[PDB]
Amino acid sequence: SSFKAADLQLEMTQKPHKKPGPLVFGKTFTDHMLMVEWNDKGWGQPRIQPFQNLTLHPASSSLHYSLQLFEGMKAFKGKDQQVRLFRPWLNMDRMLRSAMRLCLPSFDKLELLECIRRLIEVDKDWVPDAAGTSLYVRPVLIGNEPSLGVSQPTRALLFVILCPVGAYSVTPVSLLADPAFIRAWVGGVGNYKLGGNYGPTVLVQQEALKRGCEQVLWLYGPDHQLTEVGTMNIFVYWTHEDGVLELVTPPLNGVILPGVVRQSLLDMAQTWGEFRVVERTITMKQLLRALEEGRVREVFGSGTACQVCPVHRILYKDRNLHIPTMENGPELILRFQKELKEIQYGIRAHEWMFPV
Amino acid sequence: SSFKAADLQLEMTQKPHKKPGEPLVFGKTFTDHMLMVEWNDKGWGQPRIQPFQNLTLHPASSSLHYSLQLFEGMKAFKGKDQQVRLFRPWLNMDRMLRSAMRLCLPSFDKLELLECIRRLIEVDKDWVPDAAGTSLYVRPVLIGNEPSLGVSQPTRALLFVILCPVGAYFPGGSVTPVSLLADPAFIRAWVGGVGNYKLGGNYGPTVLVQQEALKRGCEQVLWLYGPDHQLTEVGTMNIFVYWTHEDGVLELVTPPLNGVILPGVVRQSLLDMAQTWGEFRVVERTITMKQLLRALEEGRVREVFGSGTACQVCPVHRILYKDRNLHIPTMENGPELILRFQKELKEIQYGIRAHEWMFPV
Ligand SMILES: *Cc1c(COP(=O)(O)O)cnc(C)c1O
Ligand SMILES: *Cc1c(COP(=O)(O)O)cnc(C)c1O
Ligand SMILES: O=C(O)Cc1noc2ccccc12
Ligand SMILES: O=C(O)Cc1noc2ccccc12
Ligand SMILES: [Cl-]
Ligand SMILES: [Cl-]
Ligand SMILES: [Cl-]
Ligand SMILES: [Cl-]
């Protein structure tokens, strides 16, 4: 049985921290945090407590065998000072799938959300309201076994911390495309937001920077499929081989993290009904022929941190490939950003937004 | 610039745990002290041996969000002469440093860590058991500890070592063979991945699969890879097959280090011993489920086993591939090679035979 928002225990801080004045993504934390413990007696009571360190047994399964998963989502403060979470239900859904994959304890998704709402409420004033700013919400679930056996955890901790953030802005990025690097494999766990999928990318992101690129384009398979950009899903807006203009993104076949922003761009594009929206594999072969025949209009990544990130260059086989994204407006990118902004900041009412 | 064992600070415990009287359960009982070394912008702090205690981590610790974590596992053995010795610890130190570099964690001096570890075991020497088939399991860990959510090279890290007295990994010991679930739906690692490093991230995803092995009546997972169902590893152990190969030659084969195999210290040791004996062909080559099925059908398999620090040499008697229960005749064949490896390792490990492989504490 899940923990209950009704059972929440609140402990306000004695010394509130001084709010910020140029925020650096994920370094500034708010006064409070959520924490819920799990053990053989099930879930304890959730609590909002002052932001404080974790105390873990040195054998903690979180640190030895990566019994760890996370989420990332944003709360936005509208003009009316009202704070809203964007599509949080989908993050709860994904978090639970991640939990099950790692044999971590199940929880009630609406209970956790209410606990998160309550936490954001307590820290409302940390939510910035300046243009392009938001509150980043980082839920985490970790195993906490005090023994070295690789086994289903009998102890777990669920916590949530909050960071006020600005951008991460609408400047295009260059990508290193090198098939030697493989982010995920069919039958793997690339489709879950597990900490173990990110650690190994640090070295690869460094190679990208040495080779004068800003992000990694993760290729998969012998046909060099374009899967993801850094921690973002990848979209290509082009006139396809059959002469039809379309928005394509790779399908959810196991090596793709099902992004919330990704699904939202699909939803928006489908709703407008102005061009084909498809989920289909994208190979470098197709991209090169499309670039050579001038069929490519825009390439970009989607994710919570950047929202929509234009791509202007891919360094593939030591040879730079120009992506004409910015030369094409980037119309679709700008259209996506505008509607998302209007929705997120409450300019248009929308079922996608959850009020705090 | 590494930490130095010369700078070790020792803080003895004021609350020593009662030692075990009852069977040792692997990795559940810990000794009185731990090694702890912190790294940051100033480089490595001073190493310390300190009472066994909890870690204090920032809630944004990159160790918990992006799996900036690696570990090791090695054993100290107490011989008849009551001398405690580590088995080939240099290789573990080598492997740990490789893991660290893969995760952009701070480099250290392998010989300095080894000395610090020696010093720590010396402090808890009375925790080292000496009954037959017992040892002290040593667990070094290195973790990133950046207090920020950026996926980046950490500027803070924590190196620690804890110790566990142990008996056998499986109840019964490496006498009783194990059954394996071999289903291609599960992949432990992939070429271009990080399965060849001892990174926490490789183990988390196996828990669910090990549950499925149990559900289907097996004890461990036989990890298969590729279109041709290559046998890669057994649980957290390397896999060995002793058979008469298709070309009629008696051989010991284990999968090659092509990226999906963790290079086990015991594995290397078994290759080394078997190569030294010069009595049969010893090779590193892929092994497919097709080749095994046929070899078993033609009665060419002698022994199949796992190797690794926790189990040492673990015999296999059954493999459930899809719905076909394959009997593996390891036990009906002695298991002569398994027994020979186990006897030789014991002689070396318990100092019955002085050896360049043992490192005295
Ligand atoms: C988090 C993440 C995304 C984007 O997901 P959103 O829910 O849109 O923020 C894409 N790819 C990977 C690999 C990720 O970890
Ligand atoms: C640790 C480990 C082994 C065996 O390594 P040893 O150094 O022999 O203990 C084998 N396979 C995997 C996957 C491992 O993690
Ligand atoms: O692109 C994203 O927003 C998803 C994401 N996945 O992992 C992250 C780590 C830090 C910041 C952001 C992320
Ligand atoms: O000793 C081994 O077999 C390797 C191993 N790798 O991970 C482990 C966890 C617990 C116990 C043992 C291990
Ligand atoms: Cl929704
Ligand atoms: Cl999926
Ligand atoms: Cl050696
Ligand atoms: Cl290797």
Coordinates of N, CA, C and O in Angstrom, one line a residue, chain A residues 185-276:
Chain A
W185 N 20.4 -0.2 -25.9 CA 20.3 -1.4 -26.8 C 18.9 -2.0 -26.6 O 18.3 -1.9 -25.6
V186 N 18.3 -2.6 -27.7 CA 17.1 -3.3 -27.6 C 17.2 -4.4 -26.6 O 18.2 -5.1 -26.5
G187 N 16.3 -4.4 -25.6 CA 16.3 -5.4 -24.5 C 17.0 -4.7 -23.3 O 17.2 -5.4 -22.3
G188 N 17.5 -3.5 -23.5 CA 18.2 -2.8 -22.4 C 17.2 -2.0 -21.6 O 16.0 -2.4 -21.6
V189 N 17.6 -0.9 -21.0 CA 16.8 -0.1 -20.1 C 16.9 1.4 -20.5 O 16.6 2.3 -19.7
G190 N 17.2 1.7 -21.8 CA 17.3 3.0 -22.3 C 16.0 3.7 -22.3 O 16.0 5.0 -22.4
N191 N 14.9 3.0 -22.3 CA 13.6 3.5 -22.3 C 13.0 3.9 -20.9 O 11.9 4.2 -20.7
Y192 N 13.9 3.8 -19.9 CA 13.5 4.1 -18.5 C 14.5 5.2 -18.0 O 15.7 5.2 -18.4
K193 N 14.1 6.1 -17.1 CA 14.9 7.2 -16.6 C 15.7 6.7 -15.4 O 15.5 7.2 -14.3
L194 N 16.6 5.8 -15.7 CA 17.4 5.2 -14.7 C 18.8 5.9 -14.7 O 19.4 6.1 -15.8
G195 N 19.3 6.2 -13.5 CA 20.6 6.8 -13.3 C 21.7 6.2 -14.1 O 22.6 6.9 -14.7
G196 N 21.7 4.8 -14.2 CA 22.7 4.1 -14.9 C 22.8 4.3 -16.4 O 23.8 3.9 -17.0
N197 N 21.8 5.0 -17.0 CA 21.9 5.3 -18.4 C 22.7 6.6 -18.6 O 23.1 6.9 -19.8
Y198 N 22.9 7.4 -17.6 CA 23.5 8.7 -17.7 C 25.0 8.8 -17.3 O 25.8 9.5 -18.0
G199 N 25.4 8.1 -16.3 CA 26.8 8.1 -15.9 C 27.8 7.8 -17.1 O 28.8 8.6 -17.2
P200 N 27.5 6.8 -17.9 CA 28.4 6.5 -19.0 C 28.5 7.5 -20.2 O 29.4 7.4 -21.0
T201 N 27.5 8.4 -20.2 CA 27.5 9.4 -21.2 C 28.5 10.6 -20.9 O 28.8 11.4 -21.8
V202 N 28.9 10.7 -19.6 CA 29.8 11.8 -19.2 C 31.1 11.9 -20.1 O 31.5 12.9 -20.6
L203 N 31.7 10.7 -20.2 CA 32.9 10.7 -21.0 C 32.6 11.0 -22.5 O 33.4 11.7 -23.1
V204 N 31.5 10.5 -23.0 CA 31.2 10.7 -24.4 C 30.9 12.2 -24.6 O 31.2 12.8 -25.6
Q205 N 30.2 12.9 -23.7 CA 29.9 14.3 -23.8 C 31.3 15.0 -23.8 O 31.5 16.0 -24.6
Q206 N 32.3 14.6 -23.0 CA 33.6 15.2 -23.1 C 34.3 15.1 -24.4 O 34.8 16.1 -24.9
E207 N 34.2 13.9 -25.0 CA 34.7 13.7 -26.4 C 34.0 14.7 -27.3 O 34.7 15.2 -28.3
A208 N 32.7 14.9 -27.2 CA 32.0 15.8 -28.0 C 32.6 17.2 -27.9 O 33.0 17.9 -29.0
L209 N 32.8 17.7 -26.7 CA 33.4 19.0 -26.5 C 34.9 19.1 -27.1 O 35.2 20.2 -27.6
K210 N 35.7 18.1 -26.9 CA 37.0 18.1 -27.5 C 36.9 18.2 -29.0 O 37.8 18.9 -29.6
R211 N 36.0 17.6 -29.6 CA 35.8 17.6 -31.1 C 34.9 18.8 -31.5 O 34.4 18.8 -32.6
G212 N 34.8 19.8 -30.6 CA 34.2 21.1 -31.0 C 32.7 21.0 -31.2 O 32.1 21.9 -31.9
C213 N 32.0 20.1 -30.5 CA 30.6 19.9 -30.6 C 30.0 20.2 -29.2 O 30.7 20.1 -28.2
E214 N 28.7 20.5 -29.2 CA 28.1 20.8 -28.0 C 27.3 19.6 -27.3 O 27.1 19.6 -26.2
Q215 N 26.8 18.7 -28.2 CA 25.9 17.6 -27.7 C 26.3 16.3 -28.4 O 27.0 16.4 -29.5
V216 N 25.8 15.2 -27.9 CA 26.0 13.9 -28.6 C 24.7 13.5 -29.3 O 23.7 13.7 -28.8
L217 N 24.9 13.1 -30.6 CA 23.8 12.5 -31.3 C 24.1 11.0 -31.2 O 25.1 10.5 -31.7
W218 N 23.1 10.3 -30.5 CA 23.3 8.9 -30.2 C 22.8 8.1 -31.4 O 21.7 8.1 -31.7
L219 N 23.7 7.4 -32.0 CA 23.4 6.6 -33.2 C 23.2 5.1 -32.7 O 23.8 4.7 -31.8
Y220 N 22.3 4.4 -33.4 CA 22.0 3.0 -33.1 C 21.9 2.1 -34.3 O 21.4 2.6 -35.4
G221 N 22.5 0.9 -34.2 CA 22.4 -0.1 -35.3 C 23.3 0.1 -36.4 O 23.9 1.1 -36.6
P222 N 23.4 -1.0 -37.3 CA 24.3 -0.9 -38.5 C 23.9 0.2 -39.5 O 24.7 0.7 -40.2
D223 N 22.6 0.5 -39.5 CA 22.1 1.6 -40.4 C 22.1 3.0 -39.7 O 21.5 3.9 -40.2
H224 N 22.8 3.1 -38.6 CA 23.1 4.4 -37.9 C 21.9 5.2 -37.7 O 21.7 6.3 -38.3
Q225 N 20.9 4.7 -37.0 CA 19.7 5.3 -36.7 C 19.9 6.5 -35.7 O 20.7 6.3 -34.8
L226 N 19.3 7.6 -35.9 CA 19.4 8.7 -35.1 C 18.3 8.5 -34.0 O 17.1 8.4 -34.2
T227 N 18.8 8.3 -32.7 CA 17.9 8.0 -31.6 C 17.5 9.1 -30.8 O 16.3 9.4 -30.5
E228 N 18.6 9.8 -30.2 CA 18.4 10.9 -29.3 C 19.6 11.9 -29.4 O 20.7 11.5 -29.9
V229 N 19.4 13.1 -28.9 CA 20.4 14.1 -28.8 C 20.6 14.5 -27.3 O 19.8 15.1 -26.7
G230 N 21.8 14.1 -26.8 CA 22.1 14.3 -25.4 C 21.1 13.6 -24.6 O 21.0 12.4 -24.7
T231 N 20.3 14.4 -23.8 CA 19.2 13.8 -23.1 C 17.8 14.3 -23.7 O 16.9 14.4 -23.0
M232 N 17.8 14.5 -25.0 CA 16.6 14.9 -25.7 C 16.2 14.0 -26.8 O 17.1 13.3 -27.4
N233 N 14.9 13.9 -27.0 CA 14.4 13.2 -28.1 C 14.7 14.0 -29.4 O 14.9 15.2 -29.3
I234 N 14.8 13.4 -30.5 CA 15.2 14.0 -31.8 C 14.0 14.0 -32.7 O 13.3 13.0 -32.8
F235 N 13.8 15.2 -33.4 CA 12.7 15.4 -34.4 C 13.3 16.0 -35.6 O 14.3 16.8 -35.6
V236 N 12.8 15.5 -36.8 CA 13.2 16.0 -38.1 C 11.9 16.5 -38.8 O 11.0 15.7 -38.9
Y237 N 12.0 17.7 -39.3 CA 10.9 18.3 -40.0 C 11.4 18.4 -41.5 O 12.3 19.1 -41.7
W238 N 10.8 17.6 -42.4 CA 11.3 17.6 -43.7 C 10.2 17.1 -44.7 O 9.1 16.7 -44.3
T239 N 10.5 17.3 -46.0 CA 9.7 16.7 -47.1 C 10.3 15.3 -47.2 O 11.4 15.1 -47.6
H240 N 9.5 14.3 -46.9 CA 9.9 12.9 -47.0 C 10.2 12.4 -48.4 O 9.7 13.1 -49.4
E241 N 10.9 11.3 -48.6 CA 11.2 10.7 -49.9 C 10.0 10.6 -50.8 O 10.1 10.7 -52.0
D242 N 8.8 10.4 -50.3 CA 7.5 10.3 -51.0 C 6.9 11.6 -51.4 O 5.8 11.7 -51.8
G243 N 7.6 12.7 -51.1 CA 7.2 14.1 -51.4 C 6.2 14.7 -50.5 O 5.8 15.9 -50.7
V244 N 5.9 14.1 -49.4 CA 5.0 14.6 -48.3 C 5.8 15.2 -47.2 O 6.8 14.6 -46.7
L245 N 5.4 16.5 -46.8 CA 6.1 17.2 -45.7 C 5.6 16.5 -44.4 O 4.4 16.3 -44.2
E246 N 6.6 16.3 -43.5 CA 6.2 15.6 -42.3 C 7.2 15.9 -41.1 O 8.3 16.3 -41.3
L247 N 6.6 15.7 -39.9 CA 7.4 15.7 -38.7 C 7.6 14.3 -38.3 O 6.6 13.6 -38.0
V248 N 8.8 13.8 -38.2 CA 9.2 12.5 -37.8 C 10.0 12.5 -36.6 O 10.9 13.4 -36.4
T249 N 9.8 11.5 -35.7 CA 10.6 11.3 -34.5 C 10.7 9.7 -34.4 O 9.8 9.0 -34.8
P250 N 11.8 9.2 -33.9 CA 11.9 7.8 -33.8 C 10.9 7.1 -32.9 O 10.5 7.8 -31.9
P251 N 10.4 5.9 -33.2 CA 9.4 5.2 -32.5 C 9.9 4.7 -31.1 O 11.1 4.5 -30.9
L252 N 8.9 4.4 -30.2 CA 9.3 3.9 -28.9 C 9.5 2.4 -29.0 O 8.7 1.6 -28.5
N253 N 10.6 2.0 -29.5 CA 11.0 0.6 -29.7 C 12.0 0.1 -28.7 O 12.7 -1.0 -28.9
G254 N 12.2 0.8 -27.6 CA 13.1 0.3 -26.5 C 14.4 1.1 -26.3 O 14.9 1.1 -25.1
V255 N 14.9 1.8 -27.3 CA 16.1 2.6 -27.2 C 15.8 4.1 -27.0 O 16.8 4.9 -26.9
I256 N 14.6 4.4 -27.0 CA 14.1 5.8 -26.9 C 13.5 6.0 -25.6 O 12.5 5.3 -25.2
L257 N 13.9 7.1 -24.9 CA 13.2 7.5 -23.7 C 11.9 8.2 -24.1 O 12.0 9.2 -24.9
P258 N 10.8 7.8 -23.7 CA 9.5 8.5 -24.1 C 9.3 9.8 -23.4 O 8.7 9.9 -22.3
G259 N 9.9 10.8 -24.0 CA 9.8 12.2 -23.4 C 8.4 12.7 -23.3 O 7.5 12.4 -24.2
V260 N 8.2 13.5 -22.3 CA 6.9 14.2 -22.1 C 6.8 15.4 -23.2 O 5.8 15.6 -23.7
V261 N 7.9 16.1 -23.4 CA 7.9 17.1 -24.4 C 7.7 16.5 -25.8 O 6.9 16.9 -26.5
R262 N 8.4 15.4 -26.0 CA 8.3 14.7 -27.3 C 6.8 14.3 -27.6 O 6.3 14.6 -28.7
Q263 N 6.1 13.7 -26.6 CA 4.7 13.4 -26.8 C 3.8 14.6 -27.1 O 2.9 14.6 -27.9
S264 N 4.2 15.7 -26.4 CA 3.4 16.9 -26.5 C 3.6 17.6 -27.9 O 2.6 18.2 -28.4
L265 N 4.8 17.5 -28.5 CA 5.0 18.0 -29.8 C 4.3 17.1 -30.9 O 3.7 17.7 -31.8
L266 N 4.3 15.8 -30.6 CA 3.5 14.9 -31.4 C 2.0 15.3 -31.4 O 1.3 15.4 -32.4
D267 N 1.5 15.5 -30.1 CA 0.1 15.8 -29.9 C -0.3 17.2 -30.6 O -1.3 17.2 -31.3
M268 N 0.5 18.2 -30.3 CA 0.3 19.5 -31.0 C 0.2 19.4 -32.5 O -0.7 19.9 -33.1
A269 N 1.2 18.8 -33.1 CA 1.4 18.6 -34.5 C 0.2 17.8 -35.1 O -0.3 18.2 -36.2
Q270 N -0.2 16.8 -34.4 CA -1.4 16.0 -34.8 C -2.6 16.9 -34.8 O -3.4 16.9 -35.8
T271 N -2.8 17.6 -33.7 CA -4.0 18.5 -33.6 C -4.1 19.5 -34.7 O -5.2 19.7 -35.2
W272 N -3.0 20.2 -35.0 CA -3.1 21.2 -36.1 C -3.5 20.6 -37.4 O -4.2 21.3 -38.2
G273 N -3.2 19.4 -37.7 CA -3.6 18.7 -38.9 C -3.1 19.3 -40.2 O -3.8 19.2 -41.3
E274 N -1.9 19.9 -40.2 CA -1.4 20.6 -41.4 C -0.3 19.9 -42.2 O 0.1 20.3 -43.2
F275 N 0.2 18.8 -41.6 CA 1.2 18.0 -42.2 C 1.3 16.6 -41.5 O 0.7 16.4 -40.5
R276 N 2.0 15.7 -42.1 CA 2.1 14.3 -41.6 C 2.9 14.3 -40.3 O 3.9 14.9 -40.3

